């Protein structure tokens, strides 16, 4: 399935993912596209912070056809 990520500029990228994919797996894909180390990423879905050992299915990524995660840059 495809998801969007809103990036630090408010633009979107698309990732090809499966519901069982971990948040750590998603953050690695975001690192490859946006150059943010995973330990400096905070990923949000519907205002909820996503935890690295959990999966997209844990956050019900399947409920909607179109989903946008939000990338935030941890503060220094």
Residue numbers in the entry: 1 to 76
The authors write:
To overcome this and to generate exclusively Ser65‐phosphorylated Ub in the Ub‐CR conformation, Leu67 was mutated to Asn, and Thr66 was mutated to Val (termed hereafter Ub TVLN mutant). Ub TVLN was phosphorylated only once, on Ser65, showed a clean, single‐species bTROSY spectrum highly similar to Ub L67S in the unphosphorylated form, and when phosphorylated was highly similar to the phosphoUb‐CR conformation (Wauer et al, 2015a). Together, this showed that Ub TVLN is an excellent mimic for the Ub‐CR conformer. Hydrogen bonding patterns observed in the crystal structures matched the experimentally determined hydrogen bonding pattern for the phosphoUb‐CR conformation (Wauer et al, 2015a), and the phosphoUb TVLN structure is similar to a recently reported NMR structure of phosphoUb‐CR. Likewise, in phosphoUb TVLN, the Ser65‐containing loop is extended and seemingly mobile, with the phosphate group exposed making no contacts to the Ub core. For Ub TVLN, we observe ~99% occupancy in the Ub‐CR conformation at 45°C, with an exchange rate of 120 s−1. PhPINK1 interaction leads to almost complete protection of the entire Ser65 loop of Ub TVLN showing that in the Ub‐CR conformation the phosphorylation site is part of the interface with PINK1. Hence, phosphorylation of the Ub‐CR mutant Ub TVLN is ~45–140‐fold faster as compared to variants where this conformation is much less populated (wt Ub) or disfavoured (Ub L71Y).
